[PDB]
C-alpha cells in the first residue's frame with residue numbers, strides 16, 4: 001500500500017487491540033509528511049512520495065504497521081503486516097554472481113571457506129571476485145559474560161563461482177605474467193604462466209638477453225615475450241640457450257651482437273661450428289689488406305671470404321682479405 | 325814326257341785338230357824358256373829341267389798339253405793328257421770361326437740361308453758376322469749353250485753360328501740401345517731394347533725429360549737410363565708418367581720443376597690433388613705480405629701455409645702468407 005495526507009501512522013509488533021487502543025505498539029504515532037519516516041529496532045520504513053517501503057533491520061520478530069485516521073477512534077486501528085517473525089537460524093544459497101552481502105542483527109560475519117576473498121565493513125560484508133569459491137559465512141554473535149556465542153544466518157556456497165564483471169584474472173610474479181587459478185582482483189591464487197596466443201609484441205626475453213626485432217634469432221618471437229599495453233612476460237618458446245656447441249649466457253667469454261643487442265657467449269665444444277651471432281669489433285690493418293675479428297675455438301661468422309670462397313680461420317680470429 | 329828347246333807349247337781342252345790349227349786352246353803358244361810356265365782356269369804348269377810338272381787347280385775339265393815344233397805346220401800339233409775331267413761335287417761344313425769363303429771354278433756362289441750376311445766378289449765370298457746363321461752357299465755355274473747350270477761345291481751350316489769375339493751385338497736407334505737378335509756390325513737384325521742389369525748411369529730419361537739426380541721421384545733409377553760406358557738408353561722401369569690425376573708431357577700447359585730440371589705438365593683432372601714437383605717462379609708482393617705462384621685448378625704444391633695450417637688456393641694460384 002502507501003501513505004495518505006490525513007492519517008496517523010505507527011508500527012506494531014502484534015495487532016492486539018486492548019481496551020484503550022492498539023496494544024502492541026512499538027512506536028509513538030506520527031502525522032503525515034511527504035517524506036515521513038518511522039523507526040524501530042526490527043524495522044525502518046519510509047514514504048516516497050507517495051509509497052510505503054521498509055528495510056527489515058533484523059528478522060526474528062514479526063511487524064505490522066498500525067494506522068488510525070487522525071480524528072478516528074483508537075480501537076479502530078488497522079494493521080497490514082510488513083514482515084513475518086521467525087527464529088532461529090538459516091541458510092541463503094548465494095547466486096552465481098552474488099556480490100554485496102549484508103548481515104542482519106548488527107552481527108559480525110564468520111568466514112569459513114576455501115581461500116581469502118572478503119571485505120568486511122562491520123556486519124556488512126562483500127565477496128571480491130570469489131571465482132572458484134566454496135565456504136559458509138555465518139553472522140554470529142558472542143556474549144561476553146557467558147562465553148556462549150551464536151549465529152543468526154548462514155549464507156552457503158557448495159558449488160564454486162564462475163567469472164564475472166571487472167575481475168582481473170592475471171598477476172605478475174616478478175616479471176612474468178601468471179594465471180589466476182582461483183579468485184580475481186587481489187584474491188588471485190596464481191597459476192601456471194601465461195602462454196602467447198598472439199598479439200602485436202613489443203619485446204622478447206631469451207637466455208637473459210632482451211631483444212626487439214626478428215634479426216639474428218632462430219625465429220621471431222621466441223623465449224618469452226610481453227605485449228605493448230601489458231606489464232609482464234608471456235611464455236612463447238623454450239628454445240635451448242645453446243646454438244650448436246656455442247651457448248649464450250650472462251658470464252663470458254667473448255661478445256658478439258644479435259639484432260642490435262649486446263650478448264655474451266661461451267663455447268661448449270671445440271669442433272668446427274657456426275657462431276650464432278654477428279660480431280662486435282672489426283679491426284683493420286691496398287697490397288694485401290685484411291679485416292678481422294676475435295672468435296671462439298673453431299667458430300665462423302658469416303660472411304665467407306669471397307676471395308678464398310671460405311670462412312678463413314687462424315684459431316682465435318677469423319679474417320677477411322682484399323688483394324689489389 | 326818333257327819340254328825341249330826347239331818346240332812351242334800351249335794347253336788344250338779338246339784333242340781336236342781342225343783345219344787351221346788345233347781347236348781346243350786355252351792359251352797362246354809359248355816359246356821354250358828354261359823356266360816357262362803355262363796357266364789357265366783348270367791347271368797351271370811349269371818346266372823346271374826340260375821335264376814337265378803341273379798342278380791341277382780344278383777337276384771337272386780334262387786337259388792336255390799341246391806341242392807344236394816351232395817350225396812345224398799348225399795342223400801337226402800333238403797332245404799329251406795331263407789329267408782327266410771328272411765332274412763330281414763335295415760339300416763342306418764351315419768351322420765356328422768360318423769367316424771367308426772361296427768358290428772354285430770361276431763359279432758364282434748363290435746363297436740360301438737365314439738372313440743377309442754376305443759380301444760377293446765374283447766367285448769368292450765373305451760372311452760378315454753370320455752370328456746365328458744357317459744355310460748353304462753353292463758355287464753354281466751356267467752354260468749358255470746348254471741351258472743347264474751347276475754347282476761344284478756346297479758349303480753347309482746346319483748348326484747356327486755362335487757369337488764370336490770380334491762381332492758388335494747391339495745397335496743404337498734414336499737414343500735407345502737395342503739388342504741384335506741376329507748379326508753383328510751392320511748385319512745386325514736388331515731386337516728388343518736392352519734391360520738394365522746394373523752399373524753406373526750417367527742419365528735417366530723419364531717422360532721425355534732428362535734427369536741426373538735421385539731427387540724428386542718414386543725412386544732412382546726409373547723409366548729408361550743410359551750407362552757411363554755407352555751411347556743410349558737401356559730400359560729399366562716404365563712408371564706411369566701420369567701422377568695422381570696430374571700428368572707430365574712435352575707440350576703444355578704450365579711448367580713446374582724436379583731436381584734442377586724444368587718439366588711441362590697438364591692437368592688430368594680437377595678434384596683436389598698434389599702436383600708432384602716444386603714450382604717455377606714465386607712472385608712476392610709491411611703488414612701482410614704474400615708470396616705465390618701459379619698452379620692447377622685444385623692442385624697444390626708443398627708446403628702448406630704454416631700460419632693457416634692449410635693449402636691456399638684461389639683458383640689458379642697457390643698462396644703463402646706472412647704476418648711477421
Ligand SMILES: *[C@@H]1O[C@H](CO)[C@@H](O[C@@H]2O[C@H](CO)[C@@H](O)[C@H](O)[C@H]2NC(C)=O)[C@H](O)[C@H]1NC(C)=O
Pocket residue numbers: 116117118186
Ligand atoms: C585477506 O584479503 C585482504 C587483501 O586486501 C587482506 O586485507 C588486509 O588485512 C590486514 C589484516 O591483517 C589489514 O591490516 C589491512 O587493513 C588489509 N589490507 C588491504 C590492502 O586490504 C586480509 O588481511 C587478508 N587476510 C589475511 C592476510 O589473513
Ligand SMILES: *[C@@H]1O[C@H](CO)[C@@H](O[C@@H]2O[C@H](CO)[C@@H](O)[C@H](O)[C@H]2NC(C)=O)[C@H](O)[C@H]1NC(C)=O
Pocket residue numbers: 128129166167168185
Ligand atoms: C578490478 O580492477 C579494475 C581496474 O582497477 C576495476 O575496474 C575499474 O573500476 C573503476 C572504479 O574505480 C571504474 O571506473 C571502471 O569500472 C574501471 N576503470 C576504468 C577506467 O574503466 C574493477 O572494478 C576491479 N574489480 C573489483 C575491485 O572487484
Ligand SMILES: *[C@@H]1O[C@H](CO)[C@@H](O[C@@H]2O[C@H](CO)[C@@H](O)[C@H](O)[C@H]2NC(C)=O)[C@H](O)[C@H]1NC(C)=O
Pocket residue numbers: 199227229230231
Ligand atoms: C593487451 O592487449 C591484448 C591484445 O589486444 C589484450 O587482449 C584482449 O583481451 C581480451 C580478453 O580480455 C581478448 O580476448 C582479446 O584478444 C583482446 N581484446 C582486444 C579488443 O584486442 C590484453 O588483455 C591486454 N593486456 C592488458 C591490458 O594487460
Ligand SMILES: *[C@@H]1O[C@H](CO)[C@@H](O[C@@H]2O[C@H](CO)[C@@H](O)[C@H](O)[C@H]2NC(C)=O)[C@H](O)[C@H]1NC(C)=O
Pocket residue numbers: 284290291320321
Ligand atoms: C674492411 O673494412 C673496410 C672499411 O675500411 C671496408 O670498406 C668497404 O669497402 C667498399 C669497397 O669495397 C667501400 O666502397 C665501402 O665504403 C666500405 N663499406 C663499409 C660498410 O664501410 C672493406 O670492404 C672491409 N672488408 C671486409 C668486411 O671484408
Ligand SMILES: *[C@@H]1O[C@H](CO)[C@@H](O[C@@H]2O[C@H](CO)[C@@H](O)[C@H](O)[C@H]2NC(C)=O)[C@H](O)[C@H]1NC(C)=O
Pocket residue numbers: 438439440
Ligand atoms: C737377303 O738379301 C736381299 C738383299 O739385301 C734381301 O732382299 C730384300 O727383300 C725385300 C723384301 O722385303 C725386297 O724388297 C728388297 O729387294 C730387299 N730389301 C732389303 C731392305 O734388303 C733379302 O730379303 C735379304 N734378307 C733379309 C733382309 O732378311
Ligand SMILES: *[C@@H]1O[C@H](CO)[C@@H](O[C@@H]2O[C@H](CO)[C@@H](O)[C@H](O)[C@H]2NC(C)=O)[C@H](O)[C@H]1NC(C)=O
Pocket residue numbers: 452453489490491492508509
Ligand atoms: C767391328 O768393327 C771393329 C773395328 O772397326 C773391329 O775391331 C777389332 O775387334 C776387337 C773386338 O773384338 C776390338 O778390340 C778392336 O778394335 C779390333 N781388334 C783387333 C785385335 O784388331 C770388329 O772386330 C769388327 N767386326 C766385324 C766387322 O765383323
Ligand SMILES: *[C@@H]1O[C@H](CO)[C@@H](O[C@@H]2O[C@H](CO)[C@@H](O)[C@H](O)[C@H]2NC(C)=O)[C@H](O)[C@H]1NC(C)=O
Pocket residue numbers: 521522523551553554555
Ligand atoms: C757397358 O757396361 C755394361 C755393364 O758392365 C756392360 O755389360 C757387360 O757385358 C757383359 C756381356 O757382354 C755382361 O754380361 C756383364 O754384365 C758386363 N760385364 C762387366 C765386366 O761388367 C756392357 O756390355 C757395356 N756396354 C758397352 C761397352 O757398350
Ligand SMILES: *[C@@H]1O[C@H](CO)[C@@H](O[C@@H]2O[C@H](CO)[C@@H](O)[C@H](O)[C@H]2NC(C)=O)[C@H](O)[C@H]1NC(C)=O
Pocket residue numbers: 608615644645646
Ligand atoms: C717469401 O719469400 C722470401 C724470400 O725473399 C722469404 O724470406 C726469407 O725467409 C726468412 C724466414 O722466413 C726471412 O727471415 C729472410 O728475410 C728470407 N731469407 C732469404 C735467404 O731470402 C719468405 O719467408 C717467403 N715466404 C714464404 C715462402 O712463405
